[PDB]
Coordinates of N, CA and C and ligand atoms in Angstrom, one line a residue:
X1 N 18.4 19.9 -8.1 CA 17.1 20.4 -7.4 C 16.5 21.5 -8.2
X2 N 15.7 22.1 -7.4 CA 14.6 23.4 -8.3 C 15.3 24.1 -8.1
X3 N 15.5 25.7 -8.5 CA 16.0 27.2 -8.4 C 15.0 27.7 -7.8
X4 N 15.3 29.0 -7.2 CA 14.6 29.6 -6.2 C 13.0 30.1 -7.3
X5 N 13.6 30.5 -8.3 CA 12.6 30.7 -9.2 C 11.2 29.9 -9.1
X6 N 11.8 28.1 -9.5 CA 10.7 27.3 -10.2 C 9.9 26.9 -9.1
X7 N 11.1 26.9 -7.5 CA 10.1 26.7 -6.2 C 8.9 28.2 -6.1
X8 N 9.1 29.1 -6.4 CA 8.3 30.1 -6.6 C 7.1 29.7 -7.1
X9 N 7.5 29.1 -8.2 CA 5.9 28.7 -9.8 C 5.4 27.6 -8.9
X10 N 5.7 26.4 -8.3 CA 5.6 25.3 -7.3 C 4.3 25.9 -6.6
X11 N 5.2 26.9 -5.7 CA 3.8 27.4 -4.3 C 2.9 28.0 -4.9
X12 N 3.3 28.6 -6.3 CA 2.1 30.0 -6.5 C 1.1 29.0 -7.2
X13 N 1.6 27.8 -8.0 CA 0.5 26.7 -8.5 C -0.6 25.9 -7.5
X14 N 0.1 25.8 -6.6 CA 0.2 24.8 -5.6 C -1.3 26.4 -4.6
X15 N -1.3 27.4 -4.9 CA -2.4 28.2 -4.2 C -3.5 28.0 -4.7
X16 N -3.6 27.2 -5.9 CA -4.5 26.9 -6.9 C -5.0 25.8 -5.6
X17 N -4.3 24.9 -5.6 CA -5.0 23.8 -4.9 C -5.5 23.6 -3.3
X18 N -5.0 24.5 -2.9 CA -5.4 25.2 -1.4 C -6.5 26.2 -1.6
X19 N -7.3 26.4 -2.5 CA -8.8 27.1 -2.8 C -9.5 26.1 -2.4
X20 N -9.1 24.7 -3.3 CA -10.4 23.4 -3.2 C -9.2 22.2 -2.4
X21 N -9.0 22.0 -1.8 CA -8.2 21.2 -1.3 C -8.8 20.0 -2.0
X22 N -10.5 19.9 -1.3 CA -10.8 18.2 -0.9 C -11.5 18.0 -2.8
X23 N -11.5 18.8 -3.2 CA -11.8 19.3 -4.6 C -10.8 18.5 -5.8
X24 N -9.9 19.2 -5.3 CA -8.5 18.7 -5.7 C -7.9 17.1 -5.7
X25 N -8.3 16.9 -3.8 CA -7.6 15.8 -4.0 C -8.8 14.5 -4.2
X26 N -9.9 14.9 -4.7 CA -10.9 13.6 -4.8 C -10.5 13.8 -6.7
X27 N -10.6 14.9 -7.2 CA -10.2 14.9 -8.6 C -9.0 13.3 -8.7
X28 N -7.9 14.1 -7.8 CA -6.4 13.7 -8.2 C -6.5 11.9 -8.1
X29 N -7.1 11.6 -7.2 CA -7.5 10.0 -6.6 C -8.4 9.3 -7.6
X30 N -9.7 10.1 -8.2 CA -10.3 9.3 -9.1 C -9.5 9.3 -10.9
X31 N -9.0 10.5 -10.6 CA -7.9 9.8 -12.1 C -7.1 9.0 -11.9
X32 N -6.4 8.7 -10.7 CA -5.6 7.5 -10.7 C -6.4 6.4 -10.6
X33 N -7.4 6.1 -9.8 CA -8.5 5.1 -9.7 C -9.3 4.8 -11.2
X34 N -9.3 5.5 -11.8 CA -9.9 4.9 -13.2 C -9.0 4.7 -14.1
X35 N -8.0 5.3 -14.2 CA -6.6 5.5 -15.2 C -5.8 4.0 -14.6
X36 N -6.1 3.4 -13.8 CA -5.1 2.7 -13.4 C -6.4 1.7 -11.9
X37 N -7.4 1.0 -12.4 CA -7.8 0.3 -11.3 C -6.9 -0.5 -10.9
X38 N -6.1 -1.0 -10.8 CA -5.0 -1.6 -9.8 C -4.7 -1.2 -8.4
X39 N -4.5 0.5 -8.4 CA -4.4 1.2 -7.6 C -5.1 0.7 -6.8
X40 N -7.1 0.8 -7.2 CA -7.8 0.6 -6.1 C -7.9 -0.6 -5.4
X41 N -7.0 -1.4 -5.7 CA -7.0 -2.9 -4.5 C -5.9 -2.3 -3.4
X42 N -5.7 -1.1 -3.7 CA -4.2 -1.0 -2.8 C -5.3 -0.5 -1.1
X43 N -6.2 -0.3 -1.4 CA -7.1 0.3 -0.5 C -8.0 -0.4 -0.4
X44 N -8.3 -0.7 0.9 CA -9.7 -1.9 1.6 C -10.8 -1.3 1.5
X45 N -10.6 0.5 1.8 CA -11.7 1.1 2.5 C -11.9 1.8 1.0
X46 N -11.9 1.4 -0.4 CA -12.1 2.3 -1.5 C -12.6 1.1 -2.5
X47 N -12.0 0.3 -2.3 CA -12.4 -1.3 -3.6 C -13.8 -1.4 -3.7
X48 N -14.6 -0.9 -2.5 CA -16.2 -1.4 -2.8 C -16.8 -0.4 -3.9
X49 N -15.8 0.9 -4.5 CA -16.3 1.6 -5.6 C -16.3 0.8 -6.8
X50 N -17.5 1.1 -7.3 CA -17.3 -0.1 -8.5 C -17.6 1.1 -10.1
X51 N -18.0 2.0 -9.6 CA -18.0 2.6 -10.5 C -17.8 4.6 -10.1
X52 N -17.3 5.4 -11.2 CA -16.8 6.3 -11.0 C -17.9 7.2 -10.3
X53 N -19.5 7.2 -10.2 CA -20.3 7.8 -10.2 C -20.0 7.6 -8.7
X54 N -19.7 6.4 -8.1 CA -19.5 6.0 -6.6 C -18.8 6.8 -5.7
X55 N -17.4 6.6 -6.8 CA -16.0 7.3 -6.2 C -16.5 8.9 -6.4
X56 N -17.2 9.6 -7.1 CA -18.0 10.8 -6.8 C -18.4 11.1 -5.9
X57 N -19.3 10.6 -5.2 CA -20.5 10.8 -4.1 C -19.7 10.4 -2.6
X58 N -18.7 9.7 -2.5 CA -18.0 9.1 -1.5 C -17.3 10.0 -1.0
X59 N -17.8 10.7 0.2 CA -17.3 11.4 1.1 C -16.0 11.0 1.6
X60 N -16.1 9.9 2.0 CA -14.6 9.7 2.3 C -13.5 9.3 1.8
X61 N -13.6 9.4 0.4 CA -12.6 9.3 -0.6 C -12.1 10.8 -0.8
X62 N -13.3 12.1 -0.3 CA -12.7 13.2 -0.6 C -11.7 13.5 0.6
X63 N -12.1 12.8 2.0 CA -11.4 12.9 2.8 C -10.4 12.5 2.8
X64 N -10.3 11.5 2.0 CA -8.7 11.1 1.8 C -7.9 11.6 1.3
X65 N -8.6 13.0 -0.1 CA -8.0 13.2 -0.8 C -7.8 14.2 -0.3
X66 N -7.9 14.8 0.6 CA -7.5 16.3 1.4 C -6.4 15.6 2.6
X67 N -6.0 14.5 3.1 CA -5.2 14.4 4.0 C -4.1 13.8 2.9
X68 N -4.0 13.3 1.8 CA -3.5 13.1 0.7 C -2.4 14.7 0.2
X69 N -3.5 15.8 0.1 CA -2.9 16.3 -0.8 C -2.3 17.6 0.5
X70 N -2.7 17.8 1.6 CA -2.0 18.4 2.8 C -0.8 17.5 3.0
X71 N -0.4 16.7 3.1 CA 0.4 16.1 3.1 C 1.4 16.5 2.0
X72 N 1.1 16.1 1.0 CA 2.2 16.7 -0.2 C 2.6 18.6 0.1
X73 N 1.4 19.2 0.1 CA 1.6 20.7 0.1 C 2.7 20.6 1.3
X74 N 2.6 20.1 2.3 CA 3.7 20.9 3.6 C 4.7 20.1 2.8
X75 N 5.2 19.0 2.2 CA 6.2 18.8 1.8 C 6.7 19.6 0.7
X76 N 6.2 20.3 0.1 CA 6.1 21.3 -1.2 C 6.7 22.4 -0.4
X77 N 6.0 22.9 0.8 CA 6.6 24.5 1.4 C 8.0 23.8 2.1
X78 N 8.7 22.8 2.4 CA 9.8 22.5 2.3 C 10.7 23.2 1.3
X79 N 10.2 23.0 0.1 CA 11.1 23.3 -0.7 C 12.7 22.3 -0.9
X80 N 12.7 20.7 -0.6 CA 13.5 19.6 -1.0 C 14.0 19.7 0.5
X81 N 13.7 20.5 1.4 CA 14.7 20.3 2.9 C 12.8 19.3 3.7
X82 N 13.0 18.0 3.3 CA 11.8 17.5 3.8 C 12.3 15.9 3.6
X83 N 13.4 15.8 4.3 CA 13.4 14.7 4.8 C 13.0 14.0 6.0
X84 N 12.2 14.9 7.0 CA 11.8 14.5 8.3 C 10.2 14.1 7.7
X85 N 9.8 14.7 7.1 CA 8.5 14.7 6.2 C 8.2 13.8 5.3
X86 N 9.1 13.6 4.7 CA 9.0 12.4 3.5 C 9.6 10.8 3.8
X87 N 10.7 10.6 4.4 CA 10.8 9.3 5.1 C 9.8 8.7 5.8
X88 N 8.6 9.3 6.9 CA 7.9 8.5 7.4 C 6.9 7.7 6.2
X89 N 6.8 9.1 5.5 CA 5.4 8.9 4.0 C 6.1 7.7 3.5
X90 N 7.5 7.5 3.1 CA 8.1 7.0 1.8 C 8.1 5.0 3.0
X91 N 8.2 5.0 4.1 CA 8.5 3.8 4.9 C 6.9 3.4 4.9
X92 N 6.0 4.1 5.5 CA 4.4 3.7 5.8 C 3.9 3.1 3.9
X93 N 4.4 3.8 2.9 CA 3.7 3.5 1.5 C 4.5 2.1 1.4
X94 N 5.9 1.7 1.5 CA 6.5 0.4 1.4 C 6.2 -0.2 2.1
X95 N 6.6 -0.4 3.8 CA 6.2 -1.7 4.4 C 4.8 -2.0 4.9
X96 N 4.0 -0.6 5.0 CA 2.7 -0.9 5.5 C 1.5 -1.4 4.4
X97 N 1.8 -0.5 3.0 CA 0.7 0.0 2.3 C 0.8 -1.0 0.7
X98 N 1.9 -1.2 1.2 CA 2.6 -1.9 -0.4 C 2.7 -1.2 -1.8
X99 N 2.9 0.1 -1.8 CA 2.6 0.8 -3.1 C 4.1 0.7 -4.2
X100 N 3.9 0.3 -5.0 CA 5.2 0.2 -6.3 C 5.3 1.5 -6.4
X101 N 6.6 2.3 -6.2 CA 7.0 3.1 -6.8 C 5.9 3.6 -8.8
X102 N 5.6 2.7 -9.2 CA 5.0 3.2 -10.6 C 4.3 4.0 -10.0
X103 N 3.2 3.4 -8.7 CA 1.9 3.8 -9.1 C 2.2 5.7 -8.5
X104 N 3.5 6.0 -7.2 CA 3.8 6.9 -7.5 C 3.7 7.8 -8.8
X105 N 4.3 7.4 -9.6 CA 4.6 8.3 -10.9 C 3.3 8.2 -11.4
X106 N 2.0 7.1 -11.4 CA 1.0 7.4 -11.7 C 0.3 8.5 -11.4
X107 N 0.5 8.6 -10.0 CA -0.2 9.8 -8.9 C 0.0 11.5 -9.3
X108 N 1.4 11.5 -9.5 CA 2.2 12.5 -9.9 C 1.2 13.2 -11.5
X109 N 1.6 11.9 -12.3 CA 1.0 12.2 -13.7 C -0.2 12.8 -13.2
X110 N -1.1 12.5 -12.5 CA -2.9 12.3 -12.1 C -3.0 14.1 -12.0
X111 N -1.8 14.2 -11.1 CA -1.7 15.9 -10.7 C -1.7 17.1 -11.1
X112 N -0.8 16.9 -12.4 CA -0.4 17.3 -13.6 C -2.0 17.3 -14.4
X113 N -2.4 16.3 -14.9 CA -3.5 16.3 -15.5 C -4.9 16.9 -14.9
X114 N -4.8 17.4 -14.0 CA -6.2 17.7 -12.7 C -6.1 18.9 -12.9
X115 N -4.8 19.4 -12.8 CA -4.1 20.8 -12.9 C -4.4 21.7 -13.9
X116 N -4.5 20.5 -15.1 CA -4.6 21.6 -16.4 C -6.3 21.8 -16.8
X117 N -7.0 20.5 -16.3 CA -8.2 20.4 -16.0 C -8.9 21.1 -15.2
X118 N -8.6 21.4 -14.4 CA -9.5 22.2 -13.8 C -9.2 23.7 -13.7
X119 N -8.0 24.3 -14.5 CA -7.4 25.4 -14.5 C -6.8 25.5 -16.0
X120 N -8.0 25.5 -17.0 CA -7.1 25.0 -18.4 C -6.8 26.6 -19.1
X121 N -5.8 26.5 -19.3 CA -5.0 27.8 -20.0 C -4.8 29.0 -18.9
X122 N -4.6 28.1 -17.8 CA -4.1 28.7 -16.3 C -3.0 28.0 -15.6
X123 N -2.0 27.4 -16.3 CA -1.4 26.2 -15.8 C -0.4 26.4 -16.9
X124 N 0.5 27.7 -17.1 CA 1.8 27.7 -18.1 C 2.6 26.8 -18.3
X125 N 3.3 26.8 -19.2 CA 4.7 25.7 -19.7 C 5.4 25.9 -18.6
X126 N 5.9 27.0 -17.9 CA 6.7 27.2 -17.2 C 6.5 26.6 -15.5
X127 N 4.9 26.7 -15.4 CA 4.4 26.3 -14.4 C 4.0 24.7 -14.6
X128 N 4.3 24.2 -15.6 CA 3.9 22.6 -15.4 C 5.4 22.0 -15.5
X129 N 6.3 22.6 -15.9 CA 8.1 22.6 -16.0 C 8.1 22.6 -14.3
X130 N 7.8 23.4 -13.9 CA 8.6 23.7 -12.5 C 7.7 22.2 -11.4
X131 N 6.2 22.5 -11.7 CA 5.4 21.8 -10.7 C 5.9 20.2 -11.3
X132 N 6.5 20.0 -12.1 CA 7.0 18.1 -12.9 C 8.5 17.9 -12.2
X133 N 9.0 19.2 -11.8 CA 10.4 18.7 -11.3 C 10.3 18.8 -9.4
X134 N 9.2 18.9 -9.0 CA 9.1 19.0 -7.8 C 8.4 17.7 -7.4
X135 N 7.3 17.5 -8.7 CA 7.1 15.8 -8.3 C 7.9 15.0 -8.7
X136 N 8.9 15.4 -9.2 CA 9.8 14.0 -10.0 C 11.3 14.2 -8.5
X137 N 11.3 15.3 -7.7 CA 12.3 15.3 -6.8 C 11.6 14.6 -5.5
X138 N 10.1 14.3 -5.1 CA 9.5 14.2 -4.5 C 9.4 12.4 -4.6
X139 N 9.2 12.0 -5.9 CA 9.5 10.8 -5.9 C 10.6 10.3 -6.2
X140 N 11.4 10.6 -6.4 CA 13.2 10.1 -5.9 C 13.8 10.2 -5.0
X141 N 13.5 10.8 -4.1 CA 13.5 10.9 -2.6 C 12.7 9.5 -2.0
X142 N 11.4 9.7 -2.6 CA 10.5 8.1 -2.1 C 11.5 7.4 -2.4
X143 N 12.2 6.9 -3.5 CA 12.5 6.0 -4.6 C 14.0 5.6 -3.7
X144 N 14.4 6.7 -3.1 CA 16.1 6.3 -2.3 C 15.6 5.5 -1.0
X145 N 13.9 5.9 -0.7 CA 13.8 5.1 1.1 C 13.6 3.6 0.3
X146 N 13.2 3.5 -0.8 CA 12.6 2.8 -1.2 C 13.6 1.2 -1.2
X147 N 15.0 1.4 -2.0 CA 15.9 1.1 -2.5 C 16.5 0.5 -0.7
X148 N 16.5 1.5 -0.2 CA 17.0 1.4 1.2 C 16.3 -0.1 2.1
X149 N 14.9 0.3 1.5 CA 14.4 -0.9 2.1 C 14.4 -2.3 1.5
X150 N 14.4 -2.0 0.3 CA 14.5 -3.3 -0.7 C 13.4 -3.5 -1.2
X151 N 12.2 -2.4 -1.3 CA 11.1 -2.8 -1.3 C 11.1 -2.6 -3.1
X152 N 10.3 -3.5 -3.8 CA 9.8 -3.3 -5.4 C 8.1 -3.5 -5.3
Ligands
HEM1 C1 1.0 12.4 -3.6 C2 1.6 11.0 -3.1 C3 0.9 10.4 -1.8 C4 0.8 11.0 -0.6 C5 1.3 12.4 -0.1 C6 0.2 10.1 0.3 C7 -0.1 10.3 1.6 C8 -0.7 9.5 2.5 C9 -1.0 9.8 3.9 C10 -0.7 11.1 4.6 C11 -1.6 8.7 4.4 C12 -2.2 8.5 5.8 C13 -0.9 8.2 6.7 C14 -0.1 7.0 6.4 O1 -0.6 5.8 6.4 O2 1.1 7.2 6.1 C15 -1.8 7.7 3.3 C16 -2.4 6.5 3.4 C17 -2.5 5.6 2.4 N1 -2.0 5.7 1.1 FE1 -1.0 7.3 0.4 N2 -0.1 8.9 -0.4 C18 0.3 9.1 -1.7 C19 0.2 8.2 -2.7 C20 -0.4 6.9 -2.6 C21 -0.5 6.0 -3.7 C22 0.0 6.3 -5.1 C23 -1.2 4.9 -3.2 C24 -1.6 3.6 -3.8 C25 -2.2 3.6 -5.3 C26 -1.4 5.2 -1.8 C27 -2.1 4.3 -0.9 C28 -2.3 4.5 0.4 C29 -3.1 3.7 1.4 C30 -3.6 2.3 0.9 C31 -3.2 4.2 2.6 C32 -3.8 3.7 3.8 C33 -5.3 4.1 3.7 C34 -6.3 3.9 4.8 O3 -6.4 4.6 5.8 O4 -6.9 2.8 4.7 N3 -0.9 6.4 -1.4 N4 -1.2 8.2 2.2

């Protein structure tokens, strides 16, 4: 798991994104949506974006991306004791939502890259080290409900 340390660099990165929440998480959604259109068939209520200027202007893509990225943060102030928190996420994305574990790791990446983007030479080695082991503990945890269920 993380040391008390790297959970430290976690939250204190992670106050970055609680300035712009819906900011944040419409960034974090249209880089996975253009980096990876696949993603966007995974969503009924997002496929009629046909182009990035769309996914811009769409209010309720930013609303997604603020109930998106609230969701991760309270699993983040966990600190890895969020298994009451992450099970329901990790069961609703397999049996309801259908998401591949990849496109996880896509998402993760997306966060990382948003991070350095919109905070460039504000976003240390130390703090992209710590914030890559909290998404990579975050999706192995998905990855164990996942296995559980049988789902690929
Ligand atoms: C940071 C990782 C993610 C988090 C924290 C997250 C969180 C959530 C939450 C809280 C909901 C609403 C409640 C629910 O249905 O469980 C939701 C819905 C959904 N998520 Fe995710 N999600 C993540 C990644 C993804 C990825 C990678 C995909 C597919 C590319 C995805 C697709 C969906 C869909 C299709 C819905 C239903 C949307 C609707 O209301 O129509 N999610 N997600």
């Amino acid at each position: 798991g993380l040391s008390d340390g790297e959970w430290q660099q976690v939250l204190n990165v992670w106050g970055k994104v609680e300035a712009d929440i819906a900011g944040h998480g419409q960034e974090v959604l249209i880089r996975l949506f253009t980096g990876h259109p696949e993603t966007l068939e995974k969503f009924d209520k997002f496929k009629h974006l046909k182009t990035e200027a769309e996914m811009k202007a769409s209010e309720d893509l930013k609303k997604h991306g603020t109930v998106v990225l609230t969701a991760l943060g309270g699993i983040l102030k966990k600190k890895g004791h969020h298994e009451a928190e992450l099970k329901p996420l990790a069961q609703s994305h397999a049996t309801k939502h259908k998401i591949p574990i990849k496109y996880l790791e896509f998402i993760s990446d997306a966060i990382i890259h948003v991070l350095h983007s919109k905070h460039p030479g504000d976003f240390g080695a130390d703090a992209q080290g710590a914030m890559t082991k909290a998404l990579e503990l975050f999706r192995n945890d998905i990855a164990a409900k996942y296995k559980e269920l049988g789902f690929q």
